[PDB]
Design an enzyme around this catalytic site. Sequence first.
Site, PDB file in Angstrom:
ATOM      1  N   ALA A 164       0.520  70.290  17.041  1.00  0.00           N
ATOM      2  CA  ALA A 164       0.289  69.468  18.247  1.00  0.00           C
ATOM      3  C   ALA A 164      -1.145  68.937  18.251  1.00  0.00           C
ATOM      4  O   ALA A 164      -2.061  69.750  18.204  1.00  0.00           O
ATOM      5  CB  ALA A 164       0.558  70.271  19.495  1.00  0.00           C
ATOM      6  N   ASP A 165      -1.341  67.615  18.336  1.00  0.00           N
ATOM      7  CA  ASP A 165      -2.692  67.046  18.618  1.00  0.00           C
ATOM      8  C   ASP A 165      -2.871  66.949  20.140  1.00  0.00           C
ATOM      9  O   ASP A 165      -1.953  67.319  20.875  1.00  0.00           O
ATOM     10  CB  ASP A 165      -2.909  65.699  17.916  1.00  0.00           C
ATOM     11  CG  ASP A 165      -1.885  64.621  18.225  1.00  0.00           C
ATOM     12  OD1 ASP A 165      -1.312  64.651  19.335  1.00  0.00           O
ATOM     13  OD2 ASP A 165      -1.651  63.773  17.336  1.00  0.00           O
ATOM     14  N   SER A 166      -3.997  66.408  20.590  1.00  0.00           N
ATOM     15  CA  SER A 166      -4.366  66.264  22.009  1.00  0.00           C
ATOM     16  C   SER A 166      -3.284  65.463  22.756  1.00  0.00           C
ATOM     17  O   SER A 166      -2.914  65.851  23.875  1.00  0.00           O
ATOM     18  CB  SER A 166      -5.756  65.634  22.076  1.00  0.00           C
ATOM     19  OG  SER A 166      -6.703  66.486  21.346  1.00  0.00           O
TER      20      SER A 166
END
Length: 82
Positions: A39-41
């Site tokens: 998961a990125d931001s």
Amino acid sequence: GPLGSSTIEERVKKIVAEQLGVKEEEVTVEKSFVDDLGADSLDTVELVMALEEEFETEIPDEEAEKITTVQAAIDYVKAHQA
């Protein structure tokens, strides 16, 4: 689950699998969204919203910071249902 039955656990795992583009089977309760499931931001911002919609709940930004694992997302949703 069969014929559209599904637990809070299965519903969290399906939303996480859909949002992060991983097999439902790789979404186990021990998994970190960022460290295990990539998961990125933006993923995390949208995943919070997808969980809020599925469970008709408000996750305040500062609660959302502490929900780092599939298990924490299940326990938060279960607590705002029972």
